[PDB]
Structure formats: structure tokens, C-alpha cells
Design a protein around this ligand. Structure first.
Ligand SMILES: Nc1ncnc2c1ncn2[C@@H]1O[C@H](COP(=O)(O)OP(=O)(O)OP(=O)(O)O)[C@@H](O)[C@H]1O
Ligand SMILES: Nc1ncnc2c1ncn2[C@@H]1O[C@H](COP(=O)(O)OP(=O)(O)O)[C@@H](O)[C@H]1O
Ligand SMILES: Nc1ncnc2c1ncn2[C@@H]1O[C@H](COP(=O)(O)OP(=O)(O)O)[C@@H](O)[C@H]1O
Ligand SMILES: [Mg+2]
Ligand SMILES: [Mg+2]
Lengths: 188, 127, 477, 467, 467
């Protein structure tokens, strides 16, 4: 078979297989950025209430769906890769999980351009200076060229401190866990 | 739901328009092989119980014709068959030689002599 | 197309359509297919709806239009159904016109709780000497009739139904019993012949017949008992007395097993699902006896079960024995021998109805039960006496068919038998005596039987006059 | 309408109809086939796909072959021209005598007569056979189970029933052979030709044969009973007469249904039978009834797996039977024919309300005396014949005379008995057994009753052999 | 929080919360119902969906309906104000007497007592029943179990035990009726009202009743045993008292689970039972222990499917009990009542260091003689009781006398048979069996022991038989 080039992050499931096929197809020939832009475009194109209502009805024949999608793709001037992907999803009847593919490829493209999603959780918000030093130290955690994608949720359930996720790495300096640890130490 | 031909290799082939240089009518590519059962992609013009022939010299009988793939049962050890192999139609349902040329001969299930007394005469064949 | 109140059959096959749409369809709601059938929406799934079709799946096709009716599965109930035959959905099948009913009751409505009920205090007369004296059935009780192939169970049910006419022709509104006969997985020829038999006995004017014969899809056989039980619950809740006879409740179990297996559910013991016990208890817990704060109505139930080769410890027989308030074990050996009704009084019990039995029958049947029990343990002097008396009683309890007896005649006959008047009569002639004796008391001495019936007891003067009658008659026989 | 074969798993074929789907149970013909292949729809998988059970070998089918939607279920030629013609499940003749020419076609998937098209009164079918008509009368429009099935006279009895019913009441008959050995099928064809119930020359046949062979796929052996039912339903409805329908074998009907259910991919139920066993049997057995126009009396040959009467197959079929006949090897040894076990035979209508008090009393007396003789035979074997009383030797003599009189000579067995067949009416049988029980013939020899028609023939035989 | 129904299959409902997910066991309220429908959470499916089991009928649930999280598991009212009341799964009174006014609620899903809480005391509880007291002596504070198929005497025995034990009991008592007849619960309620054990017009009620009878869905039968357990636990832990917890029938707690397990998408185990049978049974049955904070003397009626003690449910329950009492249908067919099988019944306190040496020796002698009789039975049944040595005939006679003597007339059966209820103190039981064993009563007829109190009543019965 054709030795497909594997994506960086492995997505699994039906969306995973379709997205890995698309990523392998795009990586050779080199069209990942353009195909991602086209995928984002079709993200809205199909979302149109008329098109969505006409594509979620399984009683319109697959022939009509494929013809309508060919007309839409021609009317939008896509790469042959995206047009063939939409045709393939339509033939197999996998339109109801099309967004999961566009989502998957996004997750698959973000890692391609080097990104490590991050999460920070605190009892209360932060002052921008402290957020800046967090940015600096977390970028210290990463490697070379690996941009960071910070997210700062606020969880009052914890009683203070901080909780930080960098990919699968996890550091929990929250008051709640220290309280739990010390309390359990007492009871033993 | 899921299909066995939805593997990312077939979808990759079909996305970049590489499915037109492959003759998916009289040839197929093995998707899976295991415990003597091969699952082949293609062979769209293959009849039920027809005999196909693998690239490695083995034979097989195509029993399960499903929308996605063909379930072939291999006539020997599946050691020689690997995923991605090429399977060609033979065109004819399985048949065996017949006649008085077999009398006194030990043959296997397909009419091949196994007693080492020489070739099998065989003027006529029969399904 | 309105994808909220209407959907399209995604996939038919097995008798379980999958519909796409009906976004506002309630669980267990009834929907109507385009062709004309009806279905019940079991599985409200995220992407479709699993509708069980109450009919033949041949008529349904992928693409058809399913329209929700807007109401939970319910059936028409009322007085308008008496004298009519109806399929499992309340649509008449006897071709006598539209059913025309004003009230509709849910088939899945829940049984009354612990406070509405009250102990069983009234007797449900079956006109079968063996049943009425040895295993009495009260009103509100659930008395399983369990037997084999051809042993006389439908005969018990039909004799009960035919016997209720003495009360349904009178004026006392507190004794009238309205019968319902649910026929499940049963030859339609038999149902037609049974309906003719009832019409010939003037027993349809107060009888509903619900049919789910063997040619009717599995969902209809699974749903017929609940339609019948709602038709009976109407009378129960309206202060009247009803008597529903499911026949059989094992064919319903087979239908439900088919329904479950076709839905790919985990088969259990004998491939029956896990809900079979729930399936039958849900149904037999509705035969209650309301207290006077709720009307005072009652709904007796006489489920019928067909054991296999006499196996009473099977799975479904044991479930329904754990649900019901008694038993009437009909034995095939006895039936073939010659005893009919072939009730095996040894193994047949009525836990509840013992206290509902009539005093006049109570006193005589007490000594009858003791005598039969003693005879059962010895099968010289006292031994010979017990054998003789037991054989007399056993030949006394044999009965004809479709000829139920009023309680007073049963009292007279059993009294003659147990007080030893037939202890000299040859054991073979007892029946010949019996059928003769009744005529005598049924002709000249109506005053005595009427007084026994009205007073509800064998008074000492009634006892003396009955003694005189029996001895004088036995003198000239 | 035209669709394409998309899948072929064994005897199951999945077809795809881009235009419009055929309802369930229709028949589709595969175009491009050397011999007619018919597929019966059974599911609607969605995406315009349907799943069909094949009625013939699916080997040599290609994913894509065109399939033509007939538009109605399997339609067979029904009429008076099917009499004496063998034909398979889909109605094509297989006796190589040319097409079955008819002006009528009937779909094999029909519905049982409604609740109002039903006779409300029981009846009796007089077959002209003493034992059957006395100890186990055949209800009109009721299923009869027939046991034994091995060199005891099942085929000769079937042929005699055919002849009597076509001679007394004038109705015809259908013989649906479900899962029929081809050797025995040909043998039966020739036995019918010899005995005369089929006539290849003058077109005066009395049987329509419908063979679902034993090497047809499971989807064909499951439907031949329905083809036979259709052929018989024509005669019931259209011709307005009483028909006989011999189904041999019924266990093979249930077994083929089970195989089809498994192939379609359904969870088996009790002993590995289809989950739809009860309804699969009921949908057929409910079309064998007594409508207000005619009637169909069925005779199922029955096989009891493992000799277990509680196996789901016979446990489900026995729910439908309205009578029973038990051919016994132990009675063909005695030279009695038909070798019907007088005591093991059963009937539902043996009821004084149906068959009448006199018939009921005669039958009960005969059964009681036969049981008495059976009990006495132990005493004879042990204590010796001397030990009997004089009110027991008399019963032994009477029971032997009754056993002899229950035997009869068939019109279709004149090349086996040297006598001439008798079709004994009912009144003759009842009177003969009433007289024998009363003791009016205690002075005759036992052999004067062997293989004779009415009682008067026994008198004449006694005169002819004593003088 | 607020989620929306997405699936409604049987009694299993899927609810999607876009905001905060509820933990497991947490209860939810379906907003928009005529009555209160509580959904107990059971799984997290991902994508912010939770599967739940509905504690009431789910008919009328619409996809997209709104569900409101409650924040805590099913909390029921506990206290001394739940005595004389009737509750259901979710703590709602069902006696139509007004809301249960308590100031303390208990979640029904507490954890089992730790290991440092168990109590090792082992006393003997005298029930006044000969078979129970002699061979399988019940213990105070231990778990007891009555095994038996349908209609062998489980409920009659448990009502006799209620009567006896809970009349001579100064502590509280709790009857949880899970999956039994509703009219049985009504009869129990009215028997207690009459017997003074419940005061509708006072505060001297000593029995709390919980009821999830058979008419209720599978989600209510599963979680009603937990409600009874919680009501009993309060009276144990908090009030620090000695409780009686009768359950009937506990099989219906596991059965109900296997009804929802199928719908929860779990692979069935042995005979269609849920894969988690033993774990659920253990978590339920280890909360009924007698700890150091109090005592629970729980009697549980356990139903044996198809009379099969090899079934996973009773077989698993056996390991959670101190004393068993395998009621048998074979014995019940002989007329013996209670049908306790003396050889299957066991007990932990049948130890010479707890019951004594005369009690232990007598129990073992009775068991030995009964086992010898069981060994002989197979030969006795065929060859007859004549091919027996004299010692064997003596054993047979003694064993039959003992079998009959173990039968007793209960007071709760006064209505069934008209006899008079009998209690038999332990000393009288031991003495009577000593006498029978020694042979003191070999001149009496075996039917002189059938259903009598102490043995002197057997002697009086024999004397009356002589007349
Ligand atoms: N009391 C009776 N006296 C004489 N015969 C009887 C009596 N009861 C029933 N029978 C006979 O038994 C036969 C079968 O009776 P019935 O239909 O009541 O049994 P069943 O169990 O309903 O049969 P099935 O199981 O086939 O429905 C009848 O034909 C009838 O003749
Ligand atoms: N009425 C009869 N007269 C003489 N012989 C008979 C009669 N009925 C059956 N037989 C004998 O029974 C044998 C078996 O016949 P048949 O039933 O046709 O075969 P099978 O039992 O295999 O179907 C025949 O050889 C025939 O001689
Ligand atoms: N001690 C007893 N004396 C007489 N009969 C009894 C006794 N115990 C049980 N029975 C019989 O068993 C029946 C009650 O069975 P029961 O135990 O209530 O069923 P289950 O085992 O389902 O609870 C009664 O009808 C009665 O005939
Ligand atoms: Mg019946
Ligand atoms: Mg009970």
C-alpha cells in the first residue's frame, strides 16, 4: 500500500481515520495550510440551516447529496483534496460526523505547527504581570519552537494555590490538595 | 458503525485521486489476513465461490462478497500472504479433473496427484 | 416535513421499525404508520426511535411516514364492549359495527397501592363442585389454573363465565360479575367456537373477548393481557365486579421472548429475558379488591398456564406461582383416567379464598376436605371405611361440561355425600344418583334450596329437612 | 423496478434499489441467470438496501447483477390444471410435462381467514376407514398429526385417504413435501401413478404435488408448505369444496424456518430454534381452517426429535393438532392394515357433544375392551390361558374379533391383499362395532372378521369359510 | 445543575449536562411530571452524558425534557417518626397519613462498617420452631436466610418468625418488602394494626415498613432494600438499639439489577445475570451486620429460581449468612410443614461450645439417622423395604418418625388448616428427639408424630388413634 505519512497526534475513531487519510494526502504534495483553510470554510458552508437540513435527512438519496456537494465545491473553488474528501464522506454517508473530522484535523494541524495546550486553574483571577511570568516559565517547560496555548480557567472549588497542565504534565500546588494530604496524614 | 475498507490507506488513496490507476475489477489488494481468512479490497467483478489467486502463488475461494470487501478463504498456510498483496481473478468456479485417468491414483481435494506417480491424465473437467 | 410530530421509517424488519424524526414523541407513546398499522415507541434513542409494530411488518416499508397520535398506549373501555369481540387494540373483529366507547384507559397504568386494597371477603362462584368446595375463589383473588395440553382448563374458565348468569340476570347490583376472556396465541377456530358457545348460553351480554390468536404478530399477543386488564380495571374502579381470564399466560411469555430476542437482548434461563417476572407481575398485580373508600369494586384474575409434561417447577410456572394467590393443578393422569375436572386437590390450594367461602358450603366442605385428606393417606376396618367414603366423594366431584351448578345444589349433593348416605350405594352409581338427586330437589323442593341460599347457611331446621329429603330419596332409588 | 446485488453472504443476498423499495416478502428475479433465481425480501436495512433470502443457489452471483422487482410475492399457478403436476416452491413444474397452464395465479403469502369467515360448529370428516372414523375421527378443517413414518403404511394410508376423500366428498388434495428426499419423492410419484391418484393421460388426477427438495437452500424448504397451502386455498375458496393437505414433514418445516432465521442473523431461542417459532408455525397453521365456503383438513407427518415430546418443535406443533394417528410397527406385524394403533390414536372431537352419544359410547366401549384385552395378555403370557374366568375369556375373544374388524382392505392396495377395497361409511362402522360389543357375533370365528368391509361382509365370510 | 434527556430506553435514561456533571449515585429530578420521578445516576459516558436508572415509570418522558440535579443521593427520612409508617423507595409515605416528620435524613448509599467495628458475640435466638431450633439454631445479631422455590413456605415461615420473635422483642423492627405481593403487604399492615404492633393514634409503634412490591419498575425494586437497610441502620448506629430487619424477597433485589444491567450495556455473565452480581450483593449485605454500635438480626427470604440451588443468585447469597434454612418442595409434598430440609440447613452456632452437649449430640444423631435413611431411599424405592436388614428397618422407622416429628403447626397457619399454633421451647424439643432417638417410642405409629407440639402430644395423639 501507499506508505502514508503519520500525523503527529494520533486521533482515533471514524473521524480519526478520515482525518489521518486527509493529513497523509495533504502532507505529500504539501497543501496542509490551504486544505485546513478550506476545511474551516466547509465548516460554515455545510452549517447553513438549509444545507444542514438537506444533508441530515437520510431519505434524500446519496446521489443527490453527492451532486449537491459537488455543486457547492465547484461554486467555492477548493483544492481537489478537499473536494474528494467531501465526496468520500458523502458516499460513505459520514456527513453527520463531518465536523468531528474538521475538529480532528484542527487538533492534528495545531500539533503539526507545534502547540502544547495548557491549562491554569486558580481560586481567583490573576494580575497580568503574574500571567506574564507564568507565560515565561511555562515556555521554559516546553521545547524549541513549541508555541504555547494558555487557558486560564477559574475554579473556586479549590481554596487557593495553582493547578497547571502542560500537555500530559501536571503540577498541582493547590491549597485543597495540601489540606487533603495533611488531613489524611493526621488520620493515619 | 464501521467498515473494514474504511482503513486510512484506502481513504488516502481515494482522496488524492490515486484510485483510477488501480484496476478494482479483476484485481484486489488484501486488507487483512489471519487464521486462513483474507479480506480483499476490490475484485468488483468476482463471483461467489469463484477462485482467486494470490500474488504469492496460493489460491483461495471467495465466499463472502460484502459491499466493502471480499472474504477469501486461503488454500494453504496464510504465512505467505501479507496485507497489501495482489489477488487476481481466475474467472472460473472451482472444478476438478475427472475420467478413468484417476483410477488407482491418490489425489488431493483439487485433483493434484500426491502419490508421485507422475502427472494426472485428465481429459475432462467438472465443477 | 414536520420532523417533530412526524418521522420516516428508517429501517423495518423483525417487527421493530426504526424511525427518524418524532422529536417530540413520548416514551411508550402510540404512533400511527401511513399504511394503517399502529406502533408503540419503545426506545427513544438520540438519533432514531424504536417503534414496535402492532401488526404485520409486511405492510410497513422504509420511507413510510410515522405520525404520533399524542397519547400513551390506551384502549377503549366501558359498558359498550360487553358482548363484543375485540382485537388487542380494542378494534372490533366480530363485524357487528364500530365499538363506540367514550372512555380510554392506558394499558400501562399502575396497579393500586397498599391502602386502597382490602382483604377478600366475597365469593366468586364457579359452579364447579371441586373448585367451589375444596379450593374456593374469592373476589379480587388471583387463582392460577395450571395444567397441560388438553386437561380441561378452558373448560373451568368457560364454566365460570357461564355460571355467572344466575347473578347477572338478577337485580342485586352487588353480585353481578362482568367477565372478560383474553385469548392469547390460541387457534382462532377455538375462539370462534368458544364465542358461539357463550352466545348459546346467553353469556355474551356480559362478556368481553380479547383475541390475539396464533396468526397475530408477537406485539399483539404481548399487549392483549394489558388491554383486557384495563377493560376490567374500568369495572374495578367504577364500583363493579369483573373477572378477567388470561388464557394462556405462557403464550404471552413466548411472544415477549420473541420480541426481546429480536431486539437482541441478553437471553436468560430457557432464553427468556430477565423481564418475564416483571412482565407477569405488572399484569397480575392489578387484580385487586378495592375498599369502600375507593368504590368497593373488584377484579378477579384467572391466569392459565400450560406446563410441559407436568413440570410445575419450570421457570414461568414458578414465576406465576410466586405471583398468584393459589393454584388449581389439573392433572393429566386423572383427566385421562376419567376424573373430570381433573383437579389434583392434593396440590391445589387457595390461600385467600378460604375465608370468602359461603357458610353453607363452608361447613359441609370442611368435613369433605378432612375426609378426602384422610383418604389420600391410605391409597381392615377404618381403612376400608376411609377408602369407601373417599371413593364415594371422588366420584361425587366428577362433573359434566358447560353445566355449572348453583351453590345450593352443590351444598345438597356434597351434604348427601359426606354424611354417609351413599356409603352403601355402589361406587359406580353415585353419578347416576347425583344427576337424578338434583332433579328431585330442583323440582319439588325449591323452598329448601331457596331458604338455604337466602339465609346463607345450613340452619338446623334446614339440616333436618335436607336429611329427610336425602334419606327418603335414597329409600326409593 | 431494478436494483443491484451489493452483497452475497451464503444464501443471503443484499440488494440495493435506487428507485423504490419493494415491501417485505416480495419476490425479486435475478437477471443474468441460466436458471430462474428468486429472492424473497425479509428486511429493510436502510439506505435503500434490502436483505433477501435466496430460493436457489447463489453461487456465481456478482456484486452488481441487476435484480428485477416482480411487485408481488411469490405467485404460483393455482387451478384445476395443477392436479397431477409436481412443481417446486416457486411454481415452476419439475416433472418435465410442460408448463402448468392456468388462468389463475395466487400469491403464497396470504392471511388467515378473518374472525367472521370462520365456521362456528365442529364437524367430522368421514374418510371411510374404520379405525380412523371410530377411535380418532378427523375433524373437518382441523390438523391431524400422523406418527410412525417408517415401513408401516404411511404412504399407502396417505394414498387411501386421498382416494376416499376424492371419491366420497369429491374434493381434491395437495401433497406438500417439505424437505423431501428426491429418491422418496420419485418413489411417491410412481406409487401415486400406479395406484391411480395421478393420471398422466386423461387428466382425471386427484392430487397436486408440491416438492420442496432436500437440497434446496433453507429459504425454499421453509416456503413450500405455503405453496401447498395456496394450491389448497384455491380449491377451498374458489372451488368451494373440502380439501386435504398432506404436509410431510412438519419438523422439516420448523427446521428450515430455524435455518433461515439463523442465516438472517437472529439470536436463537429455546433449544436453538428461531425466536419466531410460535408465530412461524401459527401463520401457516391458521390458514388450515373451515371457512364458510369450504375447508382444508391438513395431515402433518410429525417427527419428534430425540423422542422428546417437550422439544420446542413438537411442543409447538401439538398446540395446533386437532387429532392424532399412530401407525405402529407392532401392528403391521400382526397383518392388520391400516396399522393404526387403536389405543394411542387420539382425537379432540371424540366428545359426545360433537360426534353424538352413540358414536361416543361405541368408541369408549371399544377402547375399554381393547385395554382390558391388553391387560389380560400379561396374565396369558405368565399364568397361562387357563387362569382366565369365563367373563374374561369372552372379553379376550371379543377383543380379538374387534382387532380383526378394525382392519380394512384399501382400494389402493389391491396388489398387496388380493381383496377389493372397501370404503365403509360411518353408520356401517358404528353398527358393526355396536353389534360386536353387544355379543351378537360371538359364535363366529375370529378370522371371519379379518380384512373385510362392513359387518355383513364378515357374516358372508363366515358363511363362505365354514360351508 | 440542568441537563436534558437524550435517550429513554426502558427504565434507563440518558441525561446530558453541558455544565457541571453530577457524581455517581447522585439523584436527579425530572422536571415536568405529575409526580416525583427520581433518576439515580449510574455511569458517566463521556461527552458530558450520564446514564441513570429511573425510580418510577418512565412513560411520558420526552427527549429533550429537563432534568435538575439534586446534589445528594436519594435521602430518605429516618428517625423514630418512621415507626408505624409505610415508605417507598424515595422515602415518600404511601399510607396516606401525612408527611413523615423527621429532622434527620439519611442517604441510602452509605458504606459498610469497617473491620474494627464487627462484634464477635454469638448467642442463640429461640424461635419456638422444632426444626429451626434443633438442627439450624438461629443466632442473635446474625444474618439468617430462608431458601426455597415458589410456594414452599418462605412467607408463612417469615410471618411465624415475625409473630414469635418480634412479639418477645423489646427493640424496634423493620420489614422491607422488596418484590413481593402487594396484598401480602396489606395483610401484614392490617395484622400489625390489629396486633397492637402499630398505633395509628399514638407513638408506641415498633415496626417500620418499607415496600417496593412487584408492581413497581426494575429501578424501584433494586433500590428499596437499601431504603430498608438505611432505616434499620439509623436505629442501630444512632439510637444504639437492637433491631430486627425482615426482608422478603431479597432475590428480587438481584433480579431487578439483571433487568437494568442489560439496558446499561453490560456483557451478561453466567445465566444472563449482570456481571456485577456478587459485588452488588456484597455491598448490600455487608451493611446488615451487627457492629459494636448495635445489633441487627436480619431474616431474609431468598427465592431459588426453578428450585435450582446451583443458580448464581442463591449460590452467592449462601456465603453471606450465618444460618440457612433450605425449604424444600420435595418435603412439602409429603405434607411436612415447615418444609425445612434438615440436611441442607446449617448454622454457625451449631457448636458444642455454644448450644451444649445434649443439644449438639441430639442434633448430630438426628442428622446421622436422616442421612442413613436418605442413603437407603434409592434401594427402598425399587427393591422395596423388605430387602433390608433389621438394623436398616429400625433406621427407616426411626427416620420416618423423626421426619414427621420435625413438622409443626404454626399459628399463622391456623386459618389454613384449623389446627392450633404451637411453640416448643428448646428443652422440650431436645428431650423429645432424645426419646425418639433412644427408641422409647418404637411402639407408636409414625403418623402419631405428624404435626404436634411437644412429644407428649404425640403420645396423646397415638392413644387417640388407638380408639
Ligand atoms: N368436565 C369435563 N367433562 C368431560 N369432558 C371434559 C371436561 N372438561 C374438558 N373435557 C374434555 O377435554 C377436552 C379439552 O378441554 P379444554 O379445551 O378445556 O382443555 P384445554 O387445556 O383448554 O385444551 P388446550 O390446552 O388444547 O387449549 C374437551 O374436548 C372436552 O371434551
Ligand atoms: N392395506 C395394506 N395392505 C397390504 N399391505 C400394506 C397395507 N398398508 C401397508 N402395507 C405394507 O406396508 C409396506 C410399506 O408401505 P408404505 O407405507 O408405502 O412405505 P413407507 O411406510 O416407507 O412409506 C408395504 O410394503 C405394504 O406391503
Ligand atoms: N406451616 C404451614 N402449614 C400449612 N401449610 C403451609 C405452611 N407453610 C406453607 N404452607 C402452604 O404454602 C402456601 C404458602 O406459600 P408461601 O410460603 O406464601 O409461598 P412463598 O414461598 O412464595 O412465600 C400456603 O397456601 C400453604 O398451603
Ligand atoms: Mg384451552
Ligand atoms: Mg411469599
Amino acid at each position: 500500500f501507499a506508505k502514508l505519512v503519520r500525523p503527529p497526534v494520533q486521533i482515533y475513531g471514524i473521524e480519526g481515520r478520515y482525518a489521518t487519510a486527509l493529513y497523509s494526502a495533504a502532507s505529500k504534495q504539501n497543501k496542509l495550510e490551504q486544505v485546513e483553510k478550506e476545511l474551516l470554510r466547509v465548516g460554515q458552508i455545510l452549517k447553513e440551516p438549509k444545507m444542514a437540513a438537506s444533508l441530515l435527512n437520510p431519505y434524500v438519496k446519496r446521489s443527490v447529496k453527492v451532486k449537491s456537494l459537488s455543486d457547492m465545491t465547484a461554486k467555492e473553488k477548493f483544492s481537489p483534496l478537499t473536494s474528494n474528501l467531501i465526496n468520500l464522506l458523502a458516499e460513505n454517508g459520514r456527513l453527520t460526523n463531518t465536523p468531528a473530522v474538521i475538529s480532528a484535523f484542527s487538533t492534528m494541524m495545531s500539533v503539526h505547527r507545534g502547540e502544547v495546550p495548557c491549562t491554569v486553574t486558580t481560586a481567583s483571577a490573576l494580575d497580568e504581570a503574574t500571567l506574564t511570568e507564568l507565560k515565561t516559565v511555562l515556555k521554559s517547560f516546553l521545547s524549541k519552537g513549541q508555541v504555547l496555548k494558555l487557558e486560564v480557567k477559574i475554579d473556586p472549588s479549590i481554596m487557593g494555590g495553582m493547578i497547571v497542565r502542560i500537555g500530559e504534565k501536571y503540577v498541582d500546588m493547590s491549597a485543597k490538595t495540601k489540606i487533603q494530604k495533611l488531613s489524611r496524614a493526621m488520620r493515619e | 458503525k464501521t467498515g473494514t475498507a474504511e482503513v486510512s490507506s484506502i481513504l488516502e488513496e481515494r482522496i488524492l485521486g490515486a484510485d483510477t490507476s488501480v484496476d478494482l475489477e479483476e484485481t484486489g489488494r488484501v486488507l487483512s489476513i489471519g487464521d486462513g481468512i483474507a479480506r480483499v479490497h476490490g475484485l468488483r467483478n468476482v463471483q461467489a465461490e469463484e477462485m482467486v489467486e494470490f500474488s504469492s502463488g496460493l489460491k483461495g475461494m471467495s465466499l463472502n462478497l460484502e459491499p466493502d470487501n471480499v472474504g477469501v478463504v486461503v488454500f494453504g498456510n496464510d504465512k505467505l500472504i501479507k496485507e497489501g498483496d495482489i489477488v487476481k481473478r481466475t474467472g472460473a468456479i472451482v472444478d476438478v479433473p475427472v475420467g478413468e485417468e484417476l483410477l488407482g491414483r491418490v489425489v488431493d481435494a483439487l485433483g493434484n496427484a500426491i502419490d508421485g506417480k507422475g502427472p494426472i491424465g485428465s481429459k475432462a473437467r467438472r465443477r | 416535513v414536520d420532523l417533530e410530530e412526524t418521522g420516516r421509517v428508517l429501517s423495518i424488519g423483525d417487527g421493530i421499525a426504526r424511525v427518524h424524526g418524532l422529536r417530540n414523541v413520548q416514551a411508550e407513546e402510540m404512533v400511527e404508520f401511513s399504511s394503517g398499522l399502529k406502533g408503540m415507541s419503545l426506545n427513544l434513542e438520540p438519533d432514531n426511535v424504536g417503534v414496535v409494530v402492532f401488526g404485520n411488518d409486511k405492510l410497513i416499508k422504509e420511507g413510510d411516514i410515522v405520525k404520533r397520535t399524542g397519547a400513551i398506549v390506551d384502549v377503549p373501555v366501558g359498558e359498550e364492549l360487553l358482548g363484543r369481540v375485540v382485537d388487542a387494540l380494542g378494534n372490533a373483529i366480530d363485524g357487528k359495527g364500530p365499538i363506540g366507547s367514550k372512555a380510554r384507559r392506558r394499558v400501562g397504568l399502575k396497579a393500586p397501592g397498599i391502602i386502597p386494597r382490602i382483604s377478600v371477603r366475597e365469593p366468586m362462584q364457579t359452579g364447579i363442585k371441586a373448585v367451589d368446595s375444596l379450593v374456593p375463589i374469592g373476589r379480587g383473588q388471583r387463582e392460577l389454573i395450571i395444567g397441560d395440553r388438553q386437561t380441561g382448563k378452558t373448560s373451568i374458565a368457560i364454566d365460570t363465565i357461564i355460571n355467572q348468569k344466575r347473578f347477572n340476570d338478577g337485580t342485586d347490583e352487588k353480585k353481578k360479575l362482568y367477565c372478560i376472556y383474553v385469548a392469547i396465541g390460541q387457534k382462532r377456530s377455538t375462539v370462534a367456537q368458544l364465542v358461539k358457545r357463550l352466545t348459546d348460553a346467553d353469556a355474551m351480554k356480559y362478556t368481553i373477548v380479547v383475541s390475539a390468536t396464533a396468526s397475530d404478530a408477537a406485539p399483539l399477543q404481548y399487549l392483549a393481557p394489558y388491554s383486557g386488564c384495563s377493560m376490567g380495571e374500568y369495572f374495578r374502579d367504577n364500583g363493579k365486579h369483573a373477572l378477567i381470564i388470561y388464557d394462556d399466560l405462557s403464550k404471552q411469555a413466548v411472544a415477549y421472548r420473541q420480541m426481546s430476542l429480536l431486539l437482541r437482548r441478553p437471553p436468560g434461563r430457557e432464553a427468556y429475558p430477565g423481564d418475564v417476572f416483571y412482565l407477569h407481575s405488572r399484569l397480575l398485580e392489578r387484580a385487586a379488591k378495592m375498599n369502600d373508600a375507593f368504590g368497593g369494586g373488584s377484579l378477579t384474575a384467572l391466569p392459565v398456564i400450560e406446563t410441559q409434561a407436568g413440570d410445575v417447577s419450570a421457570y414461568i410456572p414458578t414465576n406465576v406461582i410466586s405471583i398468584t394467590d393459589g393454584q388449581i393443578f389439573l392433572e393429566t393422569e386423572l383427566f385421562y383416567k376419567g376424573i373430570r375436572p381433573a383437579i389434583n386437590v392434593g396440590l391445589s390450594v387457595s390461600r385467600v379464598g378460604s375465608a370468602a367461602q359461603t357458610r353453607a358450603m363452608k361447613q359441609v366442605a370442611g368435613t369433605m376436605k378432612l375426609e378426602l385428606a384422610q383418604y389420600r393417606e391410605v391409597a381392615d376396618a377404618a381403612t376400608q371405611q376411609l377408602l369407601s367414603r373417599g371413593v364415594r366423594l371422588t366420584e361425587l366431584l366428577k362433573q359434566g361440561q358447560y353445566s355449572p351448578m348453583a351453590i345450593e345444589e352443590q351444598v345438597a349433593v356434597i351434604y348427601a355425600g359426606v354424611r354417609g348416605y351413599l356409603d352403601k350405594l355402589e361406587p359406580s352409581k353415585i353419578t347416576k344418583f347425583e344427576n337424578a338427586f338434583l332433579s328431585h330437589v330442583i323440582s319439588q323442593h325449591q323452598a329448601l334450596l331457596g331458604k338455604i341460599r337466602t339465609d346463607g347457611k345450613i340452619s338446623e331446621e334446614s339440616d333436618a329437612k335436607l336429611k329427610e329429603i336425602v334419606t327418603n330419596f335414597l329409600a326409593g332409588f | 423496478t431494478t436494483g443491484r446485488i451489493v452483497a452475497v453472504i451464503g444464501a443471503v443476498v443484499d440488494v440495493q434499489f435506487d428507485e423504490g423499495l419493494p415491501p417485505i416478502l416480495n419476490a425479486l428475479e435475478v437477471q443474468g441467470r441460466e436458471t430462474r433465481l428468486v429472492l424473497e425480501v425479509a428486511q429493510h436495512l436502510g439506505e435503500s438496501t434490502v436483505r433477501t433470502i435466496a430460493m436457489d443457489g447463489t453461487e456465481g452471483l456478482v456484486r452488481g447483477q441487476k435484480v428485477l422487482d416482480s411487485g408481488a410475492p411469490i405467485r404460483i399457478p393455482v387451478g384445476p390444471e395443477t392436479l397431477g403436476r409436481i412443481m417446486n416452491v416457486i411454481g415452476e413444474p419439475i416433472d418435465e410435462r410442460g408448463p402448468i397452464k392456468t388462468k389463475q395465479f395466487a400469491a403464497i403469502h396470504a392471511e388467515a381467514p378473518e374472525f367472521v369467515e370462520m365456521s362456528v360448529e365442529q364437524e367430522i370428516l368421514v374418510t371411510g376407514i374404520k379405525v380412523v372414523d371410530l377411535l380418532a375421527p378427523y375433524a373437518k378443517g382441523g390438523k391431524i398429526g400422523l406418527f410412525g413414518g417408517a415401513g408401516v403404511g404411511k404412504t399407502v394410508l396417505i394414498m387411501e385417504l386421498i382416494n376416499n376423500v376424492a371419491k366420497a366428498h369429491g374434493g381434491y388434495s395437495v401433497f406438500a413435501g417439505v424437505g423431501e428426499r428426491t429418491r422418496e419423492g420419485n418413489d411417491l410419484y410412481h406409487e401415486m401413478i400406479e395406484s391411480g391418484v395421478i393420471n398422466l393421460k386423461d387428466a382425471t388426477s386427484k392430487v397436486a404435488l408440491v416438492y420442496g427438495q432436500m437440497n434446496e437452500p433453507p429459504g425454499a424448504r421453509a416456503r413450500v408448505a405455503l405453496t401447498g397451502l395456496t394450491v389448497a386455498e384455491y380449491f377451498r375458496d374458489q372451488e368451494g369444496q373440502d380439501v386435504l393437505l398432506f404436509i410431510d414433514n412438519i419438523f422439516r418445516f420448523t427446521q428450515a424456518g430455524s435455518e433461515v432465521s439463523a442465516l438472517l442473523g437472529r439470536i436463537p431461542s429455546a433449544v436453538g430454534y428461531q425466536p419466531t417459532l410460535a408465530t412461524d408455525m401459527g401463520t401457516m397453521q391458521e390458514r388450515i381452517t373451515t371457512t364458510k365456503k369450504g375447508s382444508i383438513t391438513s395431515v402433518q407427518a410429525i417427527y419428534v426429535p430425540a423422542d422428546d415430546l417437550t422439544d420446542p418443535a413438537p411442543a409447538t406443533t401439538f398446540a395446533h393438532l386437532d387429532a392424532t394417528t399412530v401407525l405402529s410397527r407392532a401392528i403391521a406385524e400382526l397383518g392388520i392394515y391400516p396399522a393404526v394403533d387403536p389405543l394411542d390414536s387420539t382425537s379432540r372431537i371424540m366428545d359426545p357433544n360433537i360426534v353424538g352419544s352413540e358414536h361416543y359410547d361405541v368408541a369408549r366401549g371399544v377402547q375399554k375392551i381393547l385395554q382390558d384385552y391388553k391387560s389380560l395378555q400379561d396374565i396369558i403370557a405368565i399364568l397361562g390361558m387357563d387362569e382366565l374366568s369365563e367373563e374374561d375369556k369372552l372379553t379376550v375373544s371379543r377383543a380379538r374379533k374387534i382387532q380383526r374388524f378394525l382392519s380394512q382392505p384399501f382400494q389402493v392396495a389391491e396388489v398387496f391383499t388380493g381383496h377389493l377395497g372397501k370404503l365403509v361409511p360411518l353408520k356401517e362402522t358404528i353398527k358393526g362395532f355396536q353389534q360386536i360389543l353387544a355379543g351378537e357375533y360371538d359364535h363366529l370365528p375370529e378370522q371371519a372378521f379379518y380384512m373385510v368391509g362392513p359387518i355383513e361382509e364378515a357374516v358372508a365370510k363366515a358363511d363362505k369359510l365354514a360351508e
